[PDB]
Structure formats: C-alpha cells, structure tokens
Amino acid sequence: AAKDVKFGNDARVKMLRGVNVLADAVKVTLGPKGRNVVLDKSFGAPTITKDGVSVAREIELEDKFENMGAQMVKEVASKANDAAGDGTTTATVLAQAIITEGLKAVAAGMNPMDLKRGIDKAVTAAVEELKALSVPCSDSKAIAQVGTISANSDETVGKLIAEAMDKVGKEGVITVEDGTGLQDELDVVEGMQFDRGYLSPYFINKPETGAVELESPFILLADKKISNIREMLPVLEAVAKAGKPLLIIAEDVEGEALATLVVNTMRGIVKVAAVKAPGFGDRRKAMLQDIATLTGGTVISEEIGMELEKATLEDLGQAKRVVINKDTTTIIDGVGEEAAIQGRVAQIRQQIEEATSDYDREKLQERVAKLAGGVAVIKVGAATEVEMKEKKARVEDALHATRAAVEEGVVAGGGVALIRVASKLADLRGQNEDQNVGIKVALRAMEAPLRQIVLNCGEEPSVVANTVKGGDGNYGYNAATEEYGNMIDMGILDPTKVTRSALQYAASVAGLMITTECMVTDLP
Amino acid sequence: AAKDVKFGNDARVKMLRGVNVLADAVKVTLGPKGRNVVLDKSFGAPTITKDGVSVAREIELEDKFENMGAQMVKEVASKANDAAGDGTTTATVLAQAIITEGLKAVAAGMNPMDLKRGIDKAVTAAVEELKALSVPCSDSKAIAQVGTISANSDETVGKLIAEAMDKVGKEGVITVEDGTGLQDELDVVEGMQFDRGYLSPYFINKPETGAVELESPFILLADKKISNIREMLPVLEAVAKAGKPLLIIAEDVEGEALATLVVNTMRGIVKVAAVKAPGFGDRRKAMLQDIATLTGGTVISEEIGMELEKATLEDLGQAKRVVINKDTTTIIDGVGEEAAIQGRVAQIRQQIEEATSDYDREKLQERVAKLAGGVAVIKVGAATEVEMKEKKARVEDALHATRAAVEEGVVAGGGVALIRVASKLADLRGQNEDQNVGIKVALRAMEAPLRQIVLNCGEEPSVVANTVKGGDGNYGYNAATEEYGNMIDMGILDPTKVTRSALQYAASVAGLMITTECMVTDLP
Amino acid sequence: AAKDVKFGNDARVKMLRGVNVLADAVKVTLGPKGRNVVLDKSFGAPTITKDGVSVAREIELEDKFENMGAQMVKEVASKANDAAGDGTTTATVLAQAIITEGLKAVAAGMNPMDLKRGIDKAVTAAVEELKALSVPCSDSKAIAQVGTISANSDETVGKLIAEAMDKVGKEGVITVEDGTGLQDELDVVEGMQFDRGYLSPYFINKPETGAVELESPFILLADKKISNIREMLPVLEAVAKAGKPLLIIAEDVEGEALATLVVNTMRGIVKVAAVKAPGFGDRRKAMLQDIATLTGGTVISEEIGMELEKATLEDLGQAKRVVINKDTTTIIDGVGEEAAIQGRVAQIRQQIEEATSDYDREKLQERVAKLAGGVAVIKVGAATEVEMKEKKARVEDALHATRAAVEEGVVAGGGVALIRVASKLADLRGQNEDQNVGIKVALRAMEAPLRQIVLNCGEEPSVVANTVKGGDGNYGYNAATEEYGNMIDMGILDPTKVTRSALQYAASVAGLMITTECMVTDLP
Numbered sequence A, B, C: 001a002a003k004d005v006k007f008g009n010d011a012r013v014k015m016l017r018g019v020n021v022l023a024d025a026v027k028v029t030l031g032p033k034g035r036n037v038v039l040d041k042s043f044g045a046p047t048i049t050k051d052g053v054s055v056a057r058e059i060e061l062e063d064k065f066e067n068m069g070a071q072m073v074k075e076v077a078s079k080a081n082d083a084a085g086d087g088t089t090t091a092t093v094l095a096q097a098i099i100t101e102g103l104k105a106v107a108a109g110m111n112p113m114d115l116k117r118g119i120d121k122a123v124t125a126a127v128e129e130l131k132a133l134s135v136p137c138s139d140s141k142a143i144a145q146v147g148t149i150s151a152n153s154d155e156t157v158g159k160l161i162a163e164a165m166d167k168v169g170k171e172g173v174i175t176v177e178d179g180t181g182l183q184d185e186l187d188v189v190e191g192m193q194f195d196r197g198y199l200s201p202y203f204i205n206k207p208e209t210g211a212v213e214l215e216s217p218f219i220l221l222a223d224k225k226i227s228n229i230r231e232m233l234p235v236l237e238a239v240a241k242a243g244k245p246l247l248i249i250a251e252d253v254e255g256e257a258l259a260t261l262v263v264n265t266m267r268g269i270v271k272v273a274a275v276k277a278p279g280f281g282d283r284r285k286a287m288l289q290d291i292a293t294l295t296g297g298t299v300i301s302e303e304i305g306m307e308l309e310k311a312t313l314e315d316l317g318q319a320k321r322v323v324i325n326k327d328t329t330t331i332i333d334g335v336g337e338e339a340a341i342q343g344r345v346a347q348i349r350q351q352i353e354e355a356t357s358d359y360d361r362e363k364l365q366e367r368v369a370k371l372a373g374g375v376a377v378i379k380v381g382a383a384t385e386v387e388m389k390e391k392k393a394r395v396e397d398a399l400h401a402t403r404a405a406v407e408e409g410v411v412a413g414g415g416v417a418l419i420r421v422a423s424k425l426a427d428l429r430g431q432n433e434d435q436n437v438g439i440k441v442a443l444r445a446m447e448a449p450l451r452q453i454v455l456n457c458g459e460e461p462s463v464v465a466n467t468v469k470g471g472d473g474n475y476g477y478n479a480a481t482e483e484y485g486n487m488i489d490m491g492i493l494d495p496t497k498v499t500r501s502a503l504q505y506a507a508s509v510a511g512l513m514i515t516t517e518c519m520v521t522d523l524p
Helices: A008-027 A052-056 A064-083 A088-106 A112-133 A140-150 A155-168 A233-240 A255-267 A282-295 A338-351 A359-371 A386-407 A416-424 A433-446 A448-455 A461-469 A496-513 B008-027 B052-056 B064-083 B088-106 B112-133 B140-150 B155-168 B233-240 B255-267 B282-295 B338-351 B359-371 B386-407 B416-424 B433-446 B448-455 B461-469 B496-513 C008-027 C052-056 C064-083 C088-106 C112-133 C140-150 C155-168 C233-240 C255-267 C282-295 C338-351 C359-371 C386-407 C416-424 C433-446 C448-455 C461-469 C496-513
Strands: A003-007 A037-039 A047-049 A173-178 A185-189 A192-194 A212-215 A218-222 A246-250 A272-275 A317-324 A329-334 A375-380 A410-412 A475-478 A483-486 A493-495 A516-522 B003-007 B036-039 B047-049 B173-178 B185-189 B192-194 B212-215 B218-222 B246-250 B272-275 B317-324 B329-334 B375-380 B410-412 B475-478 B483-486 B493-495 B516-522 C003-007 C036-039 C047-049 C173-178 C185-189 C192-194 C212-215 C218-222 C246-250 C272-275 C317-324 C329-334 C375-380 C410-412 C475-478 C483-486 C493-495 C518-522
Touching: A003 A008, A003 A064, A003 B008, A008 A052, A008 A064, A008 A088, A008 A516, A037 A052, A047 A052, A047 A386, A052 A064, A052 A088, A064 A088, A064 A496, A064 A516, A088 A112, A088 A433, A088 A448, A088 A496, A112 A410, A112 A416, A112 A433, A112 A496, A140 A155, A140 A386, A140 A410, A140 A493, A155 A173, A155 A185, A155 A375, A155 A386, A173 A359, A173 A386, A192 A282, A192 A359, A218 A282, A218 A317, A246 A317, A255 A272, A272 A317, A282 A317, A282 A329, A282 A338, A282 A359, A338 A359, A359 A375, A375 A386, A386 A493, A386 A496, A410 A416, A410 A496, A416 A433, A416 A448, A416 A461, A416 A475, A416 A496, A433 A496, A448 A461, A448 A475, A461 A475, A493 A496, A496 B386, B003 B008, B003 B064, B003 C008, B008 B052, B008 B064, B008 B088, B008 B516, B036 B052, B047 B052, B047 B386, B052 B064, B052 B088, B064 B088, B064 B496, B064 B516, B088 B112, B088 B433, B088 B448, B088 B496, B112 B410, B112 B416, B112 B433, B112 B496, B140 B155, B140 B386, B140 B410, B140 B493, B155 B173, B155 B185, B155 B375, B155 B386, B173 B359, B173 B386, B192 B282, B192 B359, B218 B282, B218 B317, B246 B317, B255 B272, B272 B317, B282 B317, B282 B329, B282 B338, B282 B359, B338 B359, B359 B375, B375 B386, B386 B493, B386 B496, B410 B416, B410 B496, B416 B433, B416 B448, B416 B461, B416 B475, B416 B496, B433 B496, B448 B461, B448 B475, B461 B475, B493 B496, B496 C386, C003 C008, C003 C064, C008 C052, C008 C064, C008 C088, C008 C518, C036 C052, C047 C052, C047 C386, C052 C064, C052 C088, C064 C088, C064 C496, C064 C518, C088 C112, C088 C433, C088 C448, C088 C496, C112 C410, C112 C416, C112 C433, C112 C496, C140 C155, C140 C386, C140 C410, C140 C493, C155 C173, C155 C185, C155 C375, C155 C386, C173 C359, C173 C386, C192 C282, C192 C359, C218 C282, C218 C317, C246 C317, C255 C272, C272 C317, C282 C317, C282 C329, C282 C338, C282 C359, C338 C359, C359 C375, C375 C386, C386 C493, C386 C496, C410 C416, C410 C496, C416 C433, C416 C448, C416 C461, C416 C475, C416 C496, C433 C496, C448 C461, C448 C475, C461 C475, C493 C496
Parallel strands: A173 A375, A218 A246, A246 A272, A516 B036, B173 B375, B218 B246, B246 B272, B516 C036, C173 C375, C218 C246, C246 C272
Antiparallel strands: A003 A516, A037 A047, A185 A375, A192 A329, A212 A317, A317 A329, A410 A493, A475 A483, B003 B516, B036 B047, B185 B375, B192 B329, B212 B317, B317 B329, B410 B493, B475 B483, C003 C518, C036 C047, C185 C375, C192 C329, C212 C317, C317 C329, C410 C493, C475 C483
C-alpha cells in the first residue's frame, strides 16, 4: 500500500501522543490506591483488571502514527511480564518518563544518539547499584512481603506463597487453580503424583472414595504398549505366588489383556492395576524412568533389546502404598536407594542448567519437584467468577514476583529503591554534554514510580518525593497508611529482579524511541 | 487499464518529487549523527532501523507518477545492498544528487542522452581513481576499522569481526545469530561440524552434557540409506574384534537396524553411533565425500557398484575424537592425509571460481571452511528484542562490508575519498559541451555524502566541504568528534568495494532517469 | 451492452485524438537525440525504454473512441516489429502523418475511398523505388552500420553483430543473452552443441571443469529409451575390446542400466557417457538424425524395425573429441562424409523454403547452423539490471534489423531515402483528382521521419528538410554531429526491409483509418 511518511517534530509529537494513551491507561492502576481498568471483549463479559500488561496488550489506536507509539512501549510492559511476572506497570511508567524527558531534550537541539548512550550508561550503573542494595531475599518473612505487595497488599497471598516455597523447596513447583470454596487453600503432595486415571474402572477396591488403594505393591514399568495377556503370564505368575499386589504403568493397556486383568482381580487371583504413562513422546520415557528410580525397578524398554516376558520380580519397583482415582495416580514412598534418587536429581537439576529455552526449563523442574522435594497447588477461592479471575491473576502475579526475588533478593518498595539509586548516581558523567543530559534524563525518570503512586492517592507527588529524598536508606512513604517510615520494617518490599527488569526494559525501548527522526506507515 | 501519460517537464517534476520522498526518508540515517526511521508493519511491532535499504524497500507513494520515481531509485539502494552489504544510504544520496543536478541541466536545454554519457565517463574514471587510492585492505587493523564504521562507530563489532577473519582464514565462513546473554560472543569450531543429531537418543554415553563422546573411533560412510542389520554384520564384526568405537554417517538409519544398534551398545558389545547425512540431494553426496577425505575412509556408494556388506576395516575413516548431541555432530581431528585434504580443498576452491551464480558460491565456501580452515559464529547480545534486531542487523552489515573491503581494500571515510576523486577529475572532458556539464554534474554529486553527513550533525555542510577541499590526501572531517584530521589515522575507513559500488549503481539508475521525456502509468 | 455510436466529423476528431496520444508518446524516442519513455508495471519496477513498439503496446485510453484510434495505429508499430525488428517508431510516425493529412482532405470534401487508392498507389511506387536505391547490403561494413543505427548509434553493437554474421555464415543462428561482466562478449561454437547434461554425475573424468572429456570416442544413437543393461551388452562388448570410449545419446537412460554404466567406467572396464536426446516429440528424432550424419553413424530407431542389441561397431558414429557438462553436450569434429553433411544441409535448407509459418522456420535454421556453419551467442554486459534490460533490448533490435537488411540491403538513413523517393514520385498521378490528393498526402508524409528526427534535436525541422531536399542522392543531415553530408559515408544506414516495412504498414492502417464515417463502441 501507499505509505504515509512523517518527519522530525511531527512524527515525534504523534509518536508521543500514542505512548501517552497507553501509558495513561496503564498508570491508573499503579500502587495500593491503584484503581481498575475495564477491558471489553465481544467474546465474553468484560474483564476488570489491575494488571498493567493486560491493559497494555489491548491498546491499539486509530491514528496510524499514534498507534506506532503505543505499539512500541507496549513491549516494555510485555517484556517485563515474560521475565519478572510483575512490575509491568512500573516498567510502563518509567518508559513513558524517559520518552517524555528525552524528546524534550531532542527538541532542545541535543543529539538523540548521545542522549541514548547517556540513558544506557545511567541504567548500567543503576543495575549495579540495585545489586548492592538487594538483600538477597531468602527468609520466609521477606518472601511473604514481596508476595503481599505483588498481590495489591493482600497479606494472605504473601503468607500462602511463603508457606508454599517453604514446603516444596527451591527445586519445587507451585501451580495455581480455581478453588471450589470461598477461601484459599494450599495442597502439598508428598510425594509423587501424575495426571493418570485407571483404564479399568471395575477395579476400585474402595467404593467410598472411588479409588484404588494398593497396599505395599510391586510396580511394573512397561515402555512399550500392552495388548496381549501372553507377555504378562511370566511376571504376573511370580506376583501371584508372592501375595503382594501389582501396579502396571505401561504406554497403554488394551485388548483382552486389560479385559482379563479385570477378571483376575475380580476373583482375587491377583491384585493388579493398569494406568497409562505420564507424558507423551520422548518426555514419557524420560518421566517413566524417574518412577523406576524412586521405586527401585527397571524400565522394561522394548526399544533397547528387552522383552516384557523375560522379566522377573527383580525388575519390579516397590512402594509403601499406592492411590489411583479416575484422574490421578499417586505413589506414596517407594523403595528407592537414597543416593540414587538425589543422584538422578542433581542430574536433572543440571539439565535445567543447559536447557536451551523456557519450555525445556519448565517441565524439568516439574519432575525435580515430583522427585524431591514436592509439588504444591494453591487453590484460589472467590464468591463469583469475575472475582475468581482477578484474584487468580493476582496470586499468579505474586507467585512470579517471589520467584524473581529469590533468584535476584528484595529492595525497598514504594519505588524508594529507584529514588535511592538516583542520588547515588548524582555524580555520573558521560563522554560529552549530550550524554550528560541523557544521564540526568534517566535519573529524573527514576523518580516516576514513586511520583505516580502518590498521584494515584490524590496527594502531592513532588511534596512526597522531596521528603523521601530528604531521608536515607530504606526510608519511604507508605501510601496505604499515609505516613513515612522504614519500608522494609513496614513490609513494603519489591523483588530486585522485578525492579531491575522494569528499568532495563523501559530503558531499552524508550532509548531507541527518542532517536526517531522519521516514521513510515500505511495511509488512513 | 486506461493509462495516464505525462510529458516533458510535468512528467519530470513528478518523477523528482517521488525520488525526494524516498531520498529524504533514507538520508536521515546517514553517518554517525544519523537518526533512526520507524517502519510500520501490521504483522508485528514496528521496526526501528538505521539501515538505508530497509527504509527504501518500504516507500511506495500514492500519486502514481511520484511512485514511479521512488520505485526506480529504490533500485540503487537495493543493488548496493546485494553486492556490497553496506553503503545503501550513500548510494541513495548520490543518486538523488545526480538526478537533481541532471534535471536542472535538462531544463537548461542540454541534451539528456549526452548528460548521461558525461556522468558515465566521469564515473568510469572515478572508479579507476578509487582503485588507486585503495590500500588494498589486508591487515587486521584496517579490517576492524571498516567493521567499526559499518556498525555505526561500534568498536566492539569491528574488533570482533577482525578477530573472526583472523581465525577462520580467508576461505572461511562467519555467520551471525541471536545470543542468549547481554554481551556479544565469538565461537570458533576447529575443526568440522555439521547440523545433525543422533537418531538414537538411548546412546548418550555422557548424561552430563546430554551428548555422545566416542573416543578414537572408526567412521562408516554409507551413501545409501540403511534399514537392515544384515549389511552391518560383516563390518560391525571387524569393529567388534578391534575394540574401537564406530560412527555411522548414512543417508538414514531406521527399522530394526537402528533398534538393534541400541541393544548392542547398551550391552557393551560394540560402541556405535547413528546420524543422518549432512545435506540433501546431490549436495549430500558431495559433503559426505568431504568427510571421507578428512578421516581417510571410502564412501560406500550404492550407486557406483558397491555393497555395504563387502566393506572391511580398510574403507572406514578414523578420528581422534567425536562429539554428537541432539542437534550437531563434530569430528575433532581425523586421520586425513595432509596433501589429500588441501588437494581436495584447492579443488573445491576452484569450484567457487566457476560457480555460475551466488548460491553455487555460498555453500561451496561453507564446505571449504569446514575443511580448512574453520567456521565461526558471532552471537549478538541485547537486553530486549527490538534491540536484538537492530544490533544483529548492524553486525550482519559490518560482516558484509569487511568482506567487500577484503576483495576490493579501504579508503578514507567521511566520504572524503569521493571528494578527492572529484578534484582529480577536475580536468576531465567529453566529446562536446553537453557531455561536459554531464561530467561536472557527477563530480558535484560526489560531494554529497560528505555534505549530508555534516548536515545530519546540525552543522554547516558547505563550510565543512570548503575546508576538506582545502586539504589533501586523507584529510577529512571527523563528525563524531567535530574536528578535522587524517581519516585513516582516526580509524574512519570505508571499504573500497562499497564506495565504488555506491557510485556505480547510483550513476547507473540516475543516468537513465534523467533521460525521461514521457511517463506511462495507470489512472488514479 | 448498449453501444455509443458517433458519426462523421465527431467520430473522426475523437479517432484522431486517440492516434495522437499514442503517436506523441512514441515520437519522443525517434532518432539519435531521442529520449526515453517510462512504462509503469505494478508487477516489478518500471521500465525505461526507447523502443517504439514497447511504448505503443501500453497505450490504452479512457475515452472509448479515442481508445479505438490508439488501438488501431498500435498495429502498425506492432506489425513493423514482427516483420522487420526495428523501425516501429518510424512506422508510427508515418502512420500518424498520413492520418492527419488524410482527415484534413476528407474534411475538404474529398472522397475517402479515393484518397486511400492514391495513398496505396503512391506506396506501391515508393516500394519499387526503394528496391532501386537499396544497395543490396552484403559487405561487413554496411551490416555494421545498420546494426549501429539500430542500436541508437552504438558502434560496438554494430561491430559485434557484423563479426557474428561473418563467423556463423548466412544459414547460421545468433542469439543474445545476459552476460556476467560489464562488457559485451561474442561466443562462437565450432562445431555442434545442444542443451543436454550428463544423467550420471559420477562420470566426470576431469573434476577441474566439472565436465566429461571423451577422447576420440564412438557414438551410439538410440531412438528408443533405455532402461535395461541387456540391450547394451552386444555393442558395449565390441567397444570394450576396441579401447575407444563411447557416448550414448538415447531418448533416456535410467534404471539399473544407468546405475551399472557408472560402475563400469568407475572401474575402467569401458568409458561410457549417457545424455538425453536434444528436443521433444518429432523434432527429437529429426535432430537425432542430424547427429548421425555429422558422425557417420546410424540411428537405431526402434520404430523402423531395429533392435538395440542387433547393432555392431558399424552403426556407431565417431568424433575427434567430446565435451559434456551439467547442462550442454558438444561434439568437436565428427567423422562425417563431407558430401553427406552438405547434402543433408541443402535438404534442411529447402525445408525452410516450404516452411508454412515462422516456428517451422526458426528451429530449422537453428539446426542448419549447428551443422554448417556454426552458432553464435552475444552476451550483453551492464552494471545494473535496468541497464541490462534496455541494452539487451537494443542488441536484440539490431540483430533483427541487420537480418532484414541482408534479405532486403541498405539505404540512406536519417529518413533521407524516404525524402528521395518523394521527389521521384513528384509526377505520379491517379485516376482522378481525389486520387491525386491521396498521392500528395503520402508523399508529404514521407518527409515526417526526417522532420521528427530534427524536431527531437530541438532544431528547425522545415529548415533542415528544405536543405536536404535541395541536395541529391545520399546527401542528408547528421543529427548526431549537426552537419550535412553523405549519409552512407557517415555510416548512417537504415536497412531497406525496415524502411519499406515501416511504409507499407503505416499506409495499410492509416489508409483504412481515413475512410471512417461511423464508430461503434460500449457506453462509458
């Protein structure tokens, strides 16, 4: 299509207008006296949300140039989210601030590419300075705090996540789903459990729970899929003359094999369960192996020169107890050589180390939690469903923000950390005067989160800032209670990784943004 | 469709307006105080870019005649890019200059076809003169310089490319990809490696890296695809009674053959790896042969009257070590008769000589680097992704510009080279007066790059030009530091091939362009 | 659809307006001080072109009547092109001239159908008169001249074509393709070569060129397609005990036959090449026979009661040398009975005589050049691609114009020939006064090419014409150098066939055109 092209100031005024519309819609949600934004959706009912990235992803403007503005800053809030899990509003507010101040300098005759170099240098230094301030964050109290601020000052969410990490460990997974009741609930699985129900419903040996309860049984791990009773006979026999029940985790069990297995336990010849393998593709055999380690059995892998029939009691795993329902199978305390478990763990632990993406990282720590430590689920309660959605979204947010603190500590919230690094860098200079203005531009921006937080409370933002800047260390404003104090003592902590990440990303985009001299888009 | 036809001056005024819109959008990015252009894309987020060709390819105008203007000059920036890899803005700026000055002469009553002959002659001479000035460019310092100017005055990119060419050689390949971290990184493979993972994941003899490490093994090169264990038995046997492991590079390995091979190493009968062949079609057998040379083995080609079963230890290649992961296979130091390697190299080296295109040139030098010298990868670091894209684009640009310098040396940057050849040709004349004006038109244009560079700094372009033209040799303006000096001493070097190529292409298009008396297009 | 119908003067004024728009766009390119026209193309980049027919084929107008005008004259320029290869602008300019002058007479009350008879008679006479003036054109100097004027005064193209015809002969073919370098290049194949690469890439006995070089070999010509090694054994045997290599030109070679043939030369049992047959359908067997004649072998045609197995050394052709690469096969100097070659030639030479079209003429002389004389390729050099296209187009144009001169001599260019025949016919009369005006109308038109040539130079066209008409024989204006002289001495020659053809076609269309009293078209 024919393109519209705009130059210099005109391009820039339009670009900024774009940024503002997005920035302004996101800003209204920053801080404890943050308000909500309503997001239309033809699809279903509208969405109420405080979550900065969520507002951002919906802004698209009609004026094609303004659009371009918004579509670019949208990336800071977006990137923040993918890395941190929180701070997306802060990120956005910093980005809008650098831009505003930037373009003002560009209009002063400054050289944009230098203003950028300044901003960038100021940021590299602020990041270093934040590493310094961070106190690491490792004790449950600090963790609960980031969780709390993350969840819009909701103490219970803090407490709940803190408790979670305490029980599953560091190498352990925590998921969040909808609860049934009105109140939140934490479930910890001790052991190992995976998403798999019985293939034979006519096996339930306890109709009360509607589940199979195998007492101290053997475990057969079949890599290949079963369909014939033939392959079983040899091993099924040794189990029949041993008394103990048997769980069979195969790729699949079908045909008459499954059908017969029923008639065998139905009579009381043997007690035998059949459940599919956890996973799909190459992941399945990986996870199936994990189970062998915890139970002290051998995977009967058809691929690596093994028949199902040549197996003996030797290759069978063993557990203290087994629980299987329509949806999930649980092994409570397998035999498992102690050293072999943690050996297999420290191996999968280093597989996450060289995991060449994010998905090759997720599933890996999932399995480590199943084997280690443990796995925890947070169930979120709410009265309605619009409530469920905004609450589940906040607990998900806090869950990320704590994970970030743990890997990268905490710093004084209320955006004081940022204000503190701005005075430390009061003496930073560049290679020339334009680079200098570029530094002062980032420093001045570093005040903006605090300034918006206060502005959302209906209070004088410059007056609060003046008096926080009169203080030292962790002295800040508590917007909730309307009085000044030590932010760490008042429990107002942001995780370092998030504050850092907000800064780095806003700087990255806004830095580029201010160097714009020409814009090229489609005609209206 | 019915056409609109415009004549003479009207056609030309419109054609020029077109050129300007494109020229003006490209111009803003020229030089160290160049700014960026934003390019819309419904598709994804907008693109920020300094890269002249990238802006050019997006301009399309609404007025159908103006469009034609822009669509034509767009070819200089485009052609520059395909040949050089850099200089696309310069090219564009020269082209706009010749055109402007041209049409002014045409409006004076000059004969366009003569103005063209003049321009062309002036250029043929400027090209000769540049060959003279070029000092060749062969030392690492000079190379780093073109790299640096190419990458918008980024010393690290210079250094990094210079280092690269130093290690891989002249007949060696350098690619550029996204890095994981924040900083750039150079990887050199010593040896030979190709894009191929193990077909049998159950073979990894080192679960730490998740890779297969065969110590001093034999190598079987099967041209045909394997599916049966039969063909292996004869050779697999001689390897079993020799102790040493065996790598099998076939067209494919599947069926029970693959399946059995697993059970054989799983037990410790033999140590055997299976990986597909590098490539596809006729290229595969070509590349497969290369491997035989480096290892001292024979390709067992089913096509040329050979059975896989009639092979002995004789036909197997041998290496010091082998490393195979999920994605790539590496041979570290094969047996390879020294003379036979470089013999096969100087053969493939002359295959590039008679390579009847560009693709028949690319893959060829790729293989030579795998065998010779070596292959290097530059990994680009950035904080975000909009940064990654503009940075990766600049390193790609520098990588080309150095390759051009090497094949065709360096000259004083800042567009001084061009200004220098313009005074050397002060005494060039043609067959008649119109041809003369045609020469003066190109000479006057030769000043434009310097003139734009200065104009993008917000400084008086004619005043800088006057004082550079007062000097000699390599004396120029350093736009970065705002002071005059010797451009080669200050490290501001452009590669000759690029400066030449900018000129030739702009001249070619603008030369034609000014001879336009009538234009024929579709109705609005 | 409902039609619009216009009568008499109204129809005619519109028809003329149409003609003019097309005429005017084509006119601007006539002569050495001709300018270019730009032709839009959504498809790719616009086209710059001097070539009259190319401009013509693009004009289509919006006013449906004007359109009809243009769509009709478009046929003169089109027809000129198909016959001559050049003169399309001249043709157009004459046509516009006859029309203008015609309709002026029709408006005087003259009877159109008589004006037509006059024009036609004037033309039949002008054609005769041109046959007289033509000096034949047979010497290389004259040929180079038509070539030169054809290629817009480009001496090198002249020289290059003249050289070409000199080497291939009269019964020989010259093609034109894109070159790699900057300069033009002439390639002459001595012998015979056809578009066919080896089917077996594993045969190259010289890896340096990547081609097969069979020294003094036998040649097998198989009409049928081969797939089985059986049929070969008998003959392949006699060649194996003779020492000499063997080329096999079959319809196709595949299956194990091809596969085995490899293993046979790979070992050194026999040296044997396999290439498909040149052509397709009935043309293939025709061309395959040609090869037999040059080599002294028999076509083993399965259709005419012959088995491939019953062949002996007797039926095999023989050559001095053979060269085969991936794309083409060449026979250097076959055994061939001298008389039998030229006998088969004078036979195919008369097959062109009774060739009932143009395609049955093209391929025929192609084969004669392969056998006779020889075949030549002109490779065109240019810096860019817009240059390549306009240059290749001019060399193609000159190539045609010389071929026309050869079959139908040269005459004084600058359109003096035409001006000369106009004074010879000063005394031509018709059957009545209207026929007379009709003659004067054509004569007056005959001046127009000269008149446009001059007008494109910015000079007084009537003043030049007056002074050329004051002269005699070959005295004319040299528009390039701006002085009068003998056109043949100055090398400004047009080929007779083109000048004639321009005239005949313009006359034909414009003759009809002026007899128009009513026009019927679709509604706007």
